[PDB]
Amino acid sequence: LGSYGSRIEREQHHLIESIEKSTQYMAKRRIGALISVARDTGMDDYIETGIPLNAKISSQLLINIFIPNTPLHDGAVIIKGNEIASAASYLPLSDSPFLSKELGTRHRAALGISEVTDSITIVVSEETGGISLTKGGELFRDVSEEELHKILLKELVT
Amino acid sequence: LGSYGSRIEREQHHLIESIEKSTQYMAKRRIGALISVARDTGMDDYIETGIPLNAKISSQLLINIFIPNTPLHDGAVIIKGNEIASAASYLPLSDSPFLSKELGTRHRAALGISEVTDSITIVVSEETGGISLTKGGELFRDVSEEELHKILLKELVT
Ligand SMILES: [Co+2]
Ligand SMILES: [Co+2]
């Protein structure tokens, strides 16, 4: 609880900064990433699919998880509460015919989880390095640093 | 219809040889591939998800489709009748808790389609180069050239 109105407000700003730094690092290096931040819905069903970490949130841990050809890189990192709950979780795929065919199953899975939960999911493309975000069944494609920070600030701080 | 009891028997042996040559090429080069061969069930639902090719079957076309960072590489090639019906189709993911966590969503999707259709699906891993096969909800992992030919001969010729 430093310089913020609560411990919780501080932890949420730490979560935002960890997501920003990690995606920035992984985007430059064309590293695929899938980070889904649970909110009100509760995502215990999909945490059980992956490998449980229950680890403190940091930009460095988020990077090491998605390094290619490593035991944790294929799947989704799910953040629940104030910790990284699991890695290598699989998400439901959206059946939307409106998803661009330029986007692979990683983008299609992030859309799938946004349709059935009120979570925020962040995607970094292996092909292009573009950062994308899904919420409420809607995808924002190739967002900027400024645009991403505005969405995370709006949707992840309470 | 050459040296075989029918045109159909010849086309099925051509299909087997095309699958063998392509997976052999892609396995050596660590190229991810997902080829699903429809049988009695009929897979028109999942062909509509991908990009329609309706192309003659060849080992060379199968290779060019899965080259990384190309418009057709992410997704599943579906073979229906005597042609490659579509590329970049997405398959349902199996919810089996018995799938090894070493295997990613590509292997999990091949298991998903084998549970709801009587098709044969072939997988080549980007991580390891191992060739795997799914049928009837069962996965054969890191099969050999001899083992793969025995399964395709049994399950794909009539
Ligand atoms: Co992978
Ligand atoms: Co890809």
Curated annotation (Swiss-Prot), chains A, B:
Catalytic activity line of the entry: 2 ATP = 3',3'-c-di-AMP + 2 diphosphate
Main localization category: membrane
Enzyme class: transferase
Cofactor note: Optimal activity at 0.5-1 mM CoCl(2), also functions with Mn(2+), for a construct missing residues 1-80.
GO cellular component: plasma membrane
Domain DAC: 4-145
Listed cofactors: Co(2+)
Compartments, record wording: Cell membrane
Residue numbers binding ATP: 74, 91, 104-107, 125-127
Source organism superkingdom: Bacteria
Similarity comment: Belongs to the adenylate cyclase family. DacA/CdaA subfamily.
Protein name per UniProt: Diadenylate cyclase
Full-sequence range covered: 101 to 255 of 273
